[PDB]
Scaffold this motif. Sequence first.
Motif, PDB file in Angstrom:
ATOM      1  N   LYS A 185      -2.093   3.661 -17.809  1.00 20.42           N
ATOM      2  CA  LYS A 185      -2.521   1.996 -17.761  1.00 20.42           C
ATOM      3  C   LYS A 185      -1.958   1.135 -16.693  1.00 20.42           C
ATOM      4  O   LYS A 185      -2.765   0.602 -16.195  1.00 20.42           O
ATOM      5  N   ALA A 186      -0.929   1.341 -16.754  1.00 23.38           N
ATOM      6  CA  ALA A 186      -0.586   0.091 -16.094  1.00 23.38           C
ATOM      7  C   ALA A 186      -0.824  -0.084 -14.661  1.00 23.38           C
ATOM      8  O   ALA A 186      -0.645  -0.857 -13.739  1.00 23.38           O
ATOM      9  N   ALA A 187      -0.625   1.401 -13.946  1.00 23.28           N
ATOM     10  CA  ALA A 187      -0.877   1.898 -12.318  1.00 23.28           C
ATOM     11  C   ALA A 187      -2.478   1.440 -12.064  1.00 23.28           C
ATOM     12  O   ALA A 187      -2.633   0.896 -10.919  1.00 23.28           O
ATOM     13  N   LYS A 188      -3.733   1.335 -12.818  1.00 22.78           N
ATOM     14  CA  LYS A 188      -4.849   0.776 -12.894  1.00 22.78           C
ATOM     15  C   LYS A 188      -5.013  -0.466 -12.316  1.00 22.78           C
ATOM     16  O   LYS A 188      -5.752  -1.200 -11.839  1.00 22.78           O
ATOM     17  N   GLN A 189      -4.113  -1.538 -13.359  1.00 22.36           N
ATOM     18  CA  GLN A 189      -4.000  -2.452 -13.617  1.00 22.36           C
ATOM     19  C   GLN A 189      -3.817  -3.283 -12.388  1.00 22.36           C
ATOM     20  O   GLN A 189      -4.488  -3.517 -11.959  1.00 22.36           O
ATOM     21  N   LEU A 190      -3.229  -2.187 -12.056  1.00 21.45           N
ATOM     22  CA  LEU A 190      -2.126  -2.880 -10.421  1.00 21.45           C
ATOM     23  C   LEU A 190      -3.114  -2.460  -9.525  1.00 21.45           C
ATOM     24  O   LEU A 190      -3.374  -3.331  -8.514  1.00 21.45           O
ATOM     25  N   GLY A 191      -4.169  -1.056  -9.605  1.00 16.13           N
ATOM     26  CA  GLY A 191      -4.344  -1.310  -8.223  1.00 16.13           C
ATOM     27  C   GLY A 191      -5.438  -1.968  -8.240  1.00 16.13           C
ATOM     28  O   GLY A 191      -6.249  -2.206  -7.575  1.00 16.13           O
ATOM     29  N   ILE A 219       3.155   5.385  -5.896  1.00 16.72           N
ATOM     30  CA  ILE A 219       2.896   5.303  -7.159  1.00 16.72           C
ATOM     31  C   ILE A 219       1.621   6.357  -7.690  1.00 16.72           C
ATOM     32  O   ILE A 219       2.080   6.435  -9.378  1.00 16.72           O
ATOM     33  N   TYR A 220       0.659   6.166  -7.251  1.00 18.57           N
ATOM     34  CA  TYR A 220      -0.164   7.096  -7.484  1.00 18.57           C
ATOM     35  C   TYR A 220       0.165   8.185  -7.530  1.00 18.57           C
ATOM     36  O   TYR A 220      -0.789   9.258  -7.594  1.00 18.57           O
ATOM     37  N   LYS A 221       0.752   8.553  -6.510  1.00 14.78           N
ATOM     38  CA  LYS A 221       1.651  10.382  -6.115  1.00 14.78           C
ATOM     39  C   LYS A 221       2.682  10.266  -7.502  1.00 14.78           C
ATOM     40  O   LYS A 221       2.540  11.512  -7.701  1.00 14.78           O
ATOM     41  N   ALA A 222       2.652   9.299  -8.237  1.00 17.23           N
ATOM     42  CA  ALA A 222       3.995   9.949  -9.649  1.00 17.23           C
ATOM     43  C   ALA A 222       2.816  10.312 -10.665  1.00 17.23           C
ATOM     44  O   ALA A 222       3.535  11.601 -11.551  1.00 17.23           O
ATOM     45  N   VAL A 223       2.151   9.616 -10.781  1.00 20.29           N
ATOM     46  CA  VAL A 223       0.844  10.180 -12.086  1.00 20.29           C
ATOM     47  C   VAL A 223      -0.432  10.301 -11.707  1.00 20.29           C
ATOM     48  O   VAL A 223      -1.410   9.716 -12.430  1.00 20.29           O
ATOM     49  N   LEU A 228       0.825  -0.782  -0.100  1.00 20.17           N
ATOM     50  CA  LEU A 228      -0.278  -0.055   0.326  1.00 20.17           C
ATOM     51  C   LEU A 228       1.122   1.033   0.152  1.00 20.17           C
ATOM     52  O   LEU A 228       0.741   2.335  -1.148  1.00 20.17           O
ATOM     53  N   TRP A 229       2.193   1.125   0.916  1.00 25.44           N
ATOM     54  CA  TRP A 229       2.803   2.175   0.655  1.00 25.44           C
ATOM     55  C   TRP A 229       4.158   2.594  -0.338  1.00 25.44           C
ATOM     56  O   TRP A 229       3.781   3.818  -0.660  1.00 25.44           O
ATOM     57  N   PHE A 230       3.630   1.684  -0.788  1.00 21.99           N
ATOM     58  CA  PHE A 230       4.803   1.380  -2.292  1.00 21.99           C
ATOM     59  C   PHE A 230       3.348   2.009  -3.512  1.00 21.99           C
ATOM     60  O   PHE A 230       4.185   3.065  -4.604  1.00 21.99           O
TER      61      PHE A 230
END
Length: 428
Positions: free
Chosen positions: A355-361, A179-183, A173-175
């Motif tokens: 796109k890849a961040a939404k998938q990870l989430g 990731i969500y703060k970068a994009v 969650l911390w990581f």
Amino acid sequence: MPLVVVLSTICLVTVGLNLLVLYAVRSERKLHTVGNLYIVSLSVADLIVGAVVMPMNILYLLMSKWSLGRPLCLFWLSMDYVASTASIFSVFILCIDRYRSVQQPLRYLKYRTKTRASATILGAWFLSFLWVIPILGWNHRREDKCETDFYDVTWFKVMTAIINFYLPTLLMLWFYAKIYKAVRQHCNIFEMLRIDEGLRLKIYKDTEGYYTIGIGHLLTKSPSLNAAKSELDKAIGRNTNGVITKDEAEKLFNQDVDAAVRGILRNAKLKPVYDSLDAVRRAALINMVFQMGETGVAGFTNSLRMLQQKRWDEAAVNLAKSRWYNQTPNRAKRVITTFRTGTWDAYLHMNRERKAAKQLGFIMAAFILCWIPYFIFFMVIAFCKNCCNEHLHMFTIWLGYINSTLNPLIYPLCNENFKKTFKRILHI
Ligand SMILES: CN(C)CC/C=C1\c2ccccc2COc2ccccc21
């Protein structure tokens, strides 16, 4: 009684859906991605769950005692604990990659490669296979399952609850919160017209003697610079000296936008298109109005009809044939793309990471939605001694087995390359 085949049909899809993901990676060259090797390991852990953990757990619901014996029963105790740990580990190892992938695009130093991906997907199964050790360790019977050898030990049960779930889920969650703060922008209309028109913070006098400030705010009826300065000073409400700030430029912009929507609605050819259009698609229309004017835009008869009629590709082809497109091509493309898709894509960068961040989430959102209730049920039994029936306890273990069926369904919803490969293989 009717839930005999209900859990069996769930098991039947998991044996194929996870197998489909495993075939799709080896078959397609377009799906040979380094970040997709972490999706492979997760589909492996989730296949073991479908073929070994799931059918053997159905038998315990049909026949109270196990037809398994010491060899099959001790291995089922291992394969349930090893695969579930491998699942959280595949997710945690996938998130660590996306994070460094987001941070350093130039990892041409041998980090975004098979030699670094397969080294971390092999080492992750080493920390997961360690579960086979306390399965045979009594050196240190009930009606729920095969019996974990330490089911009575509540100090060890809580230490493995954190080490294998509470500790990774918090670091994961911390990581991800990083990731969500970068994009995280996702544009708006001010940001859109900033890309297209540019933000001037000092009055500019053009070649025909015109005074512009902000996001192309013209200072109407300004013969001299001092007239333009005096009009601007009236607008902003201070002694600017031809120099405004971003926040002032945005205040002024916001005025021009209301002024543009008011004018759009006072328009006969315009009002019906705008009204039909969504949030982002209205911005693309306001943007055109900002460049050509109510009158100029309203002389886009065919395209405006395609838009009203929700024919996005027809309109995107038509608009691309316009004189407007021939004159300003890069703005017209960004605007046309926005009408086509109804997204801010044209005005955003790192769309592949995004796109890849939404998938990870989505993946992380499934694994916490499926396992949390069971781990918070472990937080309950620890001090209570059995506060509730095994009628719901049987469901929280099966809800975790639902994640094994749910993950192969997640990949096409978020990933484009998967969505087409899954469609093409179904229609052979
Ligand atoms: C019965 N089975 C579905 C539960 C075992 C799965 C676990 C678990 C539960 C308690 C203590 C350790 C472990 C192993 O690690 C896991 C990691 C993620 C999800 C479930 C488990």
